[PDB]
Amino acid sequence: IQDLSDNYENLSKLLTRYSTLNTLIKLSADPSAINAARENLGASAKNLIGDTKNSPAYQAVLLAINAAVGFWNVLGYATQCGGNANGQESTSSTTIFNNEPGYRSTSITCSLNRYKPGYYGPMSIENFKKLNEAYQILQTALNKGLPALKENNGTVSVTYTYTCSGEGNDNCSKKATGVSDQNGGTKTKTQTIDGKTVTTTISSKVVDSQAKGNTTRVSYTEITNKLDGVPDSAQALLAQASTLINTINTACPYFSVTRGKLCGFTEEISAIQKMITDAQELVNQTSVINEHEQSTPVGGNNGKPFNPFTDASFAQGMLANASAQAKMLNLAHQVGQTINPDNLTGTFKNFVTGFLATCNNSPPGTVTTQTFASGCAYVEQTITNLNNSIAHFGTQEQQIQQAENIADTLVNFKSRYSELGNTYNSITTALSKVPNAQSLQNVVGKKNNPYSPQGIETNYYLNQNSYNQIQTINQEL
């Protein structure tokens, strides 16, 4: 019998594929099972793109965004910045950006002079402005709340200010800001973001050192930026998060809390770039689902019985729909795994547990004097809510898998049905090589079906009892 262990192994493996294929074939030949799977796809799609708390897709998008914001909240205060316009070194230019996580301040001050901005040096004012604008947009949208993935018409208004002090400072100058007058001029432009018409209003105001309220006693300009109609959407915010982390990686400025270059946090930046990319690909799947609705009846709803060989035009779209939902769930889990401290070690884990997933500072998008050196982007809570939503989606995931399997079977029905017969033949052959042949031959059987109009000439059967015994013997050897 010990010489029959490979025989029972092959027989057990074939019978499992036989039963799985047989059940899948019977499912995909049944219009009621098909319509139940198509109805499940519609409901799980509505949850994926319509929910917030209970959508793993939504939670993963929020996590990728918050990891980027929290990364800058940890390191922004220690980041060296300064200089003049177009990355030129400055003599005595002090440029302060408000609503930024500075050291014991709600502002980051850029006042490093006599050093040219660049890699491993100070971040240029041009790069900080690019960084700051994305930071303010993200924080304002996160404060309002990221809408569900199906939402394409949500907007926010974003307002932020920066001041220019010191002799020779051309950062709040006209060619930099492109206004007109600096003491009272204002400019209204339009910049189309993600297909949205965004109205931008830039204002300039000069405050001489003599003025009641100017406790700084240092003649300074103030630039106020007002963006109207900024898209608050998954795709739009992921692009802003991409701009934030990539501006950090591109400028790679010097920092000192340890000291070095910001792009030296190579593990953190690689993780955030991957999470943003995975989240963007996750969001891209919504249009695949949108263009493949499963609501309309199929079959199987005409005069004659459903034929899986000819009445399965809908299967390709059903497969694309289920494929997109499975891909959304897998990518959502991938975003969690990338940043989850339980999967990290060394310096990367210490960064997440000690800094990114904490908050010394409170509504989302809040900048306080204690924000610095802390993530303050609810990274810890979002990881928990993402994994909670994945567990909540377990039943729906299973239904997506079944739908996927049914749709894949219908697309390849001729080949899958033919594989079922070939598997039956390999089983009967393998049965002839196990001793005392006429004992368990009941395990598989087939009957011709002439007067059956589904185009399926042969029905395949399986003795669940004899199937069970063969599996136990296989387990015994």
Side-chain angles (χ1 to χ4, degrees), residues 47-75:
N47 283 339
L48 276 172
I49 67 172
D51 289 345
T52 57
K53 152 170 169 147
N54 288 334
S55 171
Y58 176 91
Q59 297 296 331
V61 168
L62 186 52
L63 179 56
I65 293 166
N66 280 331
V69 177
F71 181 78
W72 177 242
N73 277 350
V74 168
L75 295 162

mmCIF file of all heavy atoms in Angstrom, residues 47-75:
data_model
loop_
_atom_site.group_PDB
_atom_site.id
_atom_site.type_symbol
_atom_site.label_atom_id
_atom_site.label_comp_id
_atom_site.label_asym_id
_atom_site.label_seq_id
_atom_site.Cartn_x
_atom_site.Cartn_y
_atom_site.Cartn_z
ATOM 1 N N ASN A 47 -20.527 49.515 -2.326
ATOM 2 C CA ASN A 47 -19.861 49.715 -1.045
ATOM 3 C C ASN A 47 -18.433 50.204 -1.239
ATOM 4 O O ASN A 47 -17.977 51.101 -0.522
ATOM 5 C CB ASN A 47 -19.877 48.420 -0.234
ATOM 6 C CG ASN A 47 -21.223 48.152 0.406
ATOM 7 O OD1 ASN A 47 -22.025 49.066 0.583
ATOM 8 N ND2 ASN A 47 -21.479 46.898 0.752
ATOM 9 N N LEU A 48 -17.719 49.636 -2.213
ATOM 10 C CA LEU A 48 -16.322 50.007 -2.424
ATOM 11 C C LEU A 48 -16.187 51.482 -2.782
ATOM 12 O O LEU A 48 -15.322 52.185 -2.248
ATOM 13 C CB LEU A 48 -15.709 49.128 -3.513
ATOM 14 C CG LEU A 48 -15.196 47.768 -3.038
ATOM 15 C CD1 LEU A 48 -14.786 46.899 -4.215
ATOM 16 C CD2 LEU A 48 -14.038 47.954 -2.072
ATOM 17 N N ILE A 49 -17.041 51.974 -3.683
ATOM 18 C CA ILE A 49 -16.935 53.355 -4.146
ATOM 19 C C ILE A 49 -17.890 54.301 -3.431
ATOM 20 O O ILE A 49 -17.788 55.523 -3.626
ATOM 21 C CB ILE A 49 -17.150 53.450 -5.673
ATOM 22 C CG1 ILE A 49 -18.592 53.096 -6.040
ATOM 23 C CG2 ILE A 49 -16.170 52.547 -6.406
ATOM 24 C CD1 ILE A 49 -18.925 53.342 -7.496
ATOM 25 N N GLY A 50 -18.799 53.789 -2.603
ATOM 26 C CA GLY A 50 -19.758 54.641 -1.926
ATOM 27 C C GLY A 50 -19.520 54.799 -0.438
ATOM 28 O O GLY A 50 -19.938 55.797 0.156
ATOM 29 N N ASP A 51 -18.914 53.927 0.251
ATOM 30 C CA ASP A 51 -18.623 53.941 1.676
ATOM 31 C C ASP A 51 -17.348 54.717 1.975
ATOM 32 O O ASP A 51 -16.525 54.990 1.096
ATOM 33 C CB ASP A 51 -18.447 52.529 2.225
ATOM 34 C CG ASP A 51 -19.731 51.765 2.287
ATOM 35 O OD1 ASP A 51 -20.786 52.420 2.176
ATOM 36 O OD2 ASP A 51 -19.686 50.525 2.443
ATOM 37 N N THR A 52 -17.211 55.080 3.175
ATOM 38 C CA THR A 52 -15.964 55.604 3.717
ATOM 39 C C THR A 52 -15.400 54.629 4.743
ATOM 40 O O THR A 52 -14.409 53.948 4.466
ATOM 41 C CB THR A 52 -16.175 56.991 4.331
ATOM 42 O OG1 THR A 52 -17.190 56.920 5.340
ATOM 43 C CG2 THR A 52 -16.597 57.988 3.261
ATOM 44 N N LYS A 53 -16.026 54.522 5.919
ATOM 45 C CA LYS A 53 -15.517 53.641 6.967
ATOM 46 C C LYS A 53 -15.444 52.193 6.500
ATOM 47 O O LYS A 53 -14.460 51.494 6.774
ATOM 48 C CB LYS A 53 -16.396 53.753 8.214
ATOM 49 C CG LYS A 53 -16.419 52.496 9.072
ATOM 50 C CD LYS A 53 -17.098 52.739 10.409
ATOM 51 C CE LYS A 53 -17.358 51.429 11.138
ATOM 52 N NZ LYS A 53 -17.256 51.586 12.614
ATOM 53 N N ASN A 54 -16.465 51.726 5.787
ATOM 54 C CA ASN A 54 -16.582 50.320 5.427
ATOM 55 C C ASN A 54 -16.015 50.001 4.048
ATOM 56 O O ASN A 54 -16.259 48.906 3.533
ATOM 57 C CB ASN A 54 -18.048 49.884 5.495
ATOM 58 C CG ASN A 54 -18.555 49.779 6.919
ATOM 59 O OD1 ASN A 54 -17.780 49.567 7.851
ATOM 60 N ND2 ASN A 54 -19.862 49.930 7.095
ATOM 61 N N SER A 55 -15.273 50.920 3.440
ATOM 62 C CA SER A 55 -14.657 50.655 2.146
ATOM 63 C C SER A 55 -13.154 50.516 2.322
ATOM 64 O O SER A 55 -12.483 51.506 2.655
ATOM 65 C CB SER A 55 -14.975 51.770 1.149
ATOM 66 O OG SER A 55 -14.213 51.618 -0.039
ATOM 67 N N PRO A 56 -12.582 49.324 2.125
ATOM 68 C CA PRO A 56 -11.116 49.206 2.181
ATOM 69 C C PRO A 56 -10.422 50.073 1.151
ATOM 70 O O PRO A 56 -9.317 50.571 1.407
ATOM 71 C CB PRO A 56 -10.872 47.712 1.923
ATOM 72 C CG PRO A 56 -12.181 47.043 2.237
ATOM 73 C CD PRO A 56 -13.232 48.033 1.842
ATOM 74 N N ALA A 57 -11.048 50.273 -0.011
ATOM 75 C CA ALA A 57 -10.477 51.146 -1.030
ATOM 76 C C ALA A 57 -10.353 52.575 -0.519
ATOM 77 O O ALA A 57 -9.308 53.217 -0.680
ATOM 78 C CB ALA A 57 -11.336 51.097 -2.292
ATOM 79 N N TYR A 58 -11.417 53.090 0.101
ATOM 80 C CA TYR A 58 -11.375 54.436 0.664
ATOM 81 C C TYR A 58 -10.305 54.543 1.744
ATOM 82 O O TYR A 58 -9.537 55.511 1.781
ATOM 83 C CB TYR A 58 -12.750 54.805 1.226
ATOM 84 C CG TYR A 58 -12.803 56.149 1.922
ATOM 85 C CD1 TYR A 58 -13.123 57.303 1.219
ATOM 86 C CD2 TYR A 58 -12.545 56.262 3.284
ATOM 87 C CE1 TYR A 58 -13.177 58.530 1.849
ATOM 88 C CE2 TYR A 58 -12.595 57.485 3.921
ATOM 89 C CZ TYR A 58 -12.912 58.615 3.201
ATOM 90 O OH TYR A 58 -12.965 59.835 3.833
ATOM 91 N N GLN A 59 -10.245 53.552 2.637
ATOM 92 C CA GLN A 59 -9.293 53.606 3.741
ATOM 93 C C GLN A 59 -7.855 53.570 3.238
ATOM 94 O O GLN A 59 -6.974 54.227 3.807
ATOM 95 C CB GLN A 59 -9.553 52.454 4.711
ATOM 96 C CG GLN A 59 -10.913 52.507 5.392
ATOM 97 C CD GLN A 59 -11.067 53.717 6.291
ATOM 98 O OE1 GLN A 59 -10.088 54.229 6.836
ATOM 99 N NE2 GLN A 59 -12.299 54.185 6.450
ATOM 100 N N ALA A 60 -7.596 52.810 2.172
ATOM 101 C CA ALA A 60 -6.239 52.729 1.640
ATOM 102 C C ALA A 60 -5.825 54.036 0.979
ATOM 103 O O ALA A 60 -4.670 54.461 1.101
ATOM 104 C CB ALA A 60 -6.129 51.570 0.650
ATOM 105 N N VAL A 61 -6.752 54.683 0.268
ATOM 106 C CA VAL A 61 -6.463 55.993 -0.309
ATOM 107 C C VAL A 61 -6.147 56.992 0.795
ATOM 108 O O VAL A 61 -5.164 57.740 0.723
ATOM 109 C CB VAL A 61 -7.641 56.468 -1.178
ATOM 110 C CG1 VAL A 61 -7.484 57.940 -1.532
ATOM 111 C CG2 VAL A 61 -7.750 55.618 -2.431
ATOM 112 N N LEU A 62 -6.978 57.009 1.839
ATOM 113 C CA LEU A 62 -6.749 57.905 2.967
ATOM 114 C C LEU A 62 -5.411 57.620 3.641
ATOM 115 O O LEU A 62 -4.717 58.546 4.075
ATOM 116 C CB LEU A 62 -7.899 57.773 3.966
ATOM 117 C CG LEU A 62 -7.949 58.718 5.166
ATOM 118 C CD1 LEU A 62 -7.847 60.163 4.716
ATOM 119 C CD2 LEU A 62 -9.231 58.491 5.954
ATOM 120 N N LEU A 63 -5.027 56.344 3.725
ATOM 121 C CA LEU A 63 -3.770 55.990 4.379
ATOM 122 C C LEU A 63 -2.572 56.503 3.589
ATOM 123 O O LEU A 63 -1.634 57.066 4.164
ATOM 124 C CB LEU A 63 -3.683 54.474 4.567
ATOM 125 C CG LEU A 63 -2.402 53.956 5.225
ATOM 126 C CD1 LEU A 63 -2.180 54.631 6.570
ATOM 127 C CD2 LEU A 63 -2.449 52.444 5.383
ATOM 128 N N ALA A 64 -2.584 56.313 2.267
ATOM 129 C CA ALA A 64 -1.480 56.797 1.443
ATOM 130 C C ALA A 64 -1.348 58.313 1.531
ATOM 131 O O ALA A 64 -0.233 58.847 1.565
ATOM 132 C CB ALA A 64 -1.678 56.356 -0.007
ATOM 133 N N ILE A 65 -2.477 59.022 1.579
ATOM 134 C CA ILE A 65 -2.444 60.476 1.700
ATOM 135 C C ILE A 65 -1.893 60.885 3.060
ATOM 136 O O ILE A 65 -1.046 61.780 3.164
ATOM 137 C CB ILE A 65 -3.849 61.062 1.467
ATOM 138 C CG1 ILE A 65 -4.285 60.856 0.017
ATOM 139 C CG2 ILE A 65 -3.883 62.538 1.836
ATOM 140 C CD1 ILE A 65 -5.762 61.093 -0.207
ATOM 141 N N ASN A 66 -2.364 60.231 4.123
ATOM 142 C CA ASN A 66 -1.971 60.621 5.472
ATOM 143 C C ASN A 66 -0.512 60.288 5.759
ATOM 144 O O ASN A 66 0.147 61.011 6.514
ATOM 145 C CB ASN A 66 -2.885 59.947 6.494
ATOM 146 C CG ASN A 66 -4.216 60.660 6.641
ATOM 147 O OD1 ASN A 66 -4.309 61.871 6.443
ATOM 148 N ND2 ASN A 66 -5.252 59.913 7.001
ATOM 149 N N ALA A 67 0.005 59.204 5.177
ATOM 150 C CA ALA A 67 1.417 58.882 5.353
ATOM 151 C C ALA A 67 2.304 59.969 4.761
ATOM 152 O O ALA A 67 3.354 60.298 5.324
ATOM 153 C CB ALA A 67 1.730 57.526 4.720
ATOM 154 N N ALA A 68 1.891 60.546 3.630
ATOM 155 C CA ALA A 68 2.670 61.613 3.009
ATOM 156 C C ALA A 68 2.627 62.884 3.848
ATOM 157 O O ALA A 68 3.665 63.508 4.098
ATOM 158 C CB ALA A 68 2.156 61.884 1.594
ATOM 159 N N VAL A 69 1.431 63.285 4.285
ATOM 160 C CA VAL A 69 1.298 64.482 5.112
ATOM 161 C C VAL A 69 2.041 64.301 6.430
ATOM 162 O O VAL A 69 2.788 65.182 6.872
ATOM 163 C CB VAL A 69 -0.187 64.812 5.347
ATOM 164 C CG1 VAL A 69 -0.329 66.018 6.266
ATOM 165 C CG2 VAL A 69 -0.896 65.056 4.023
ATOM 166 N N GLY A 70 1.847 63.149 7.078
ATOM 167 C CA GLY A 70 2.516 62.898 8.343
ATOM 168 C C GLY A 70 4.025 62.844 8.221
ATOM 169 O O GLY A 70 4.741 63.195 9.164
ATOM 170 N N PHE A 71 4.531 62.400 7.067
ATOM 171 C CA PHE A 71 5.974 62.378 6.851
ATOM 172 C C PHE A 71 6.559 63.783 6.915
ATOM 173 O O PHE A 71 7.601 64.002 7.544
ATOM 174 C CB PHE A 71 6.288 61.724 5.504
ATOM 175 C CG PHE A 71 7.757 61.629 5.199
ATOM 176 C CD1 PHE A 71 8.538 60.644 5.781
ATOM 177 C CD2 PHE A 71 8.353 62.518 4.319
ATOM 178 C CE1 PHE A 71 9.888 60.552 5.497
ATOM 179 C CE2 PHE A 71 9.703 62.430 4.031
ATOM 180 C CZ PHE A 71 10.471 61.444 4.619
ATOM 181 N N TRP A 72 5.895 64.749 6.277
ATOM 182 C CA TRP A 72 6.377 66.125 6.313
ATOM 183 C C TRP A 72 6.169 66.748 7.687
ATOM 184 O O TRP A 72 6.995 67.547 8.144
ATOM 185 C CB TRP A 72 5.679 66.954 5.236
ATOM 186 C CG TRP A 72 6.062 68.400 5.254
ATOM 187 C CD1 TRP A 72 5.237 69.464 5.476
ATOM 188 C CD2 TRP A 72 7.370 68.944 5.038
ATOM 189 N NE1 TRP A 72 5.950 70.636 5.413
ATOM 190 C CE2 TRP A 72 7.262 70.346 5.145
ATOM 191 C CE3 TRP A 72 8.622 68.384 4.764
ATOM 192 C CZ2 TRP A 72 8.356 71.193 4.987
ATOM 193 C CZ3 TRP A 72 9.708 69.228 4.608
ATOM 194 C CH2 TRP A 72 9.567 70.617 4.719
ATOM 195 N N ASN A 73 5.069 66.397 8.360
ATOM 196 C CA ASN A 73 4.840 66.895 9.712
ATOM 197 C C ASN A 73 5.939 66.447 10.665
ATOM 198 O O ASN A 73 6.263 67.164 11.620
ATOM 199 C CB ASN A 73 3.475 66.428 10.221
ATOM 200 C CG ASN A 73 2.337 67.309 9.743
ATOM 201 O OD1 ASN A 73 2.559 68.384 9.186
ATOM 202 N ND2 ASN A 73 1.107 66.857 9.961
ATOM 203 N N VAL A 74 6.527 65.274 10.424
ATOM 204 C CA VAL A 74 7.601 64.790 11.286
ATOM 205 C C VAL A 74 8.883 65.583 11.048
ATOM 206 O O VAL A 74 9.575 65.967 11.999
ATOM 207 C CB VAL A 74 7.824 63.282 11.064
ATOM 208 C CG1 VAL A 74 9.122 62.830 11.721
ATOM 209 C CG2 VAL A 74 6.646 62.480 11.601
ATOM 210 N N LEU A 75 9.213 65.853 9.784
ATOM 211 C CA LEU A 75 10.535 66.346 9.422
ATOM 212 C C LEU A 75 10.565 67.793 8.951
ATOM 213 O O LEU A 75 11.661 68.338 8.769
ATOM 214 C CB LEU A 75 11.142 65.458 8.325
ATOM 215 C CG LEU A 75 11.434 64.012 8.723
ATOM 216 C CD1 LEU A 75 11.612 63.142 7.491
ATOM 217 C CD2 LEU A 75 12.662 63.942 9.615
#
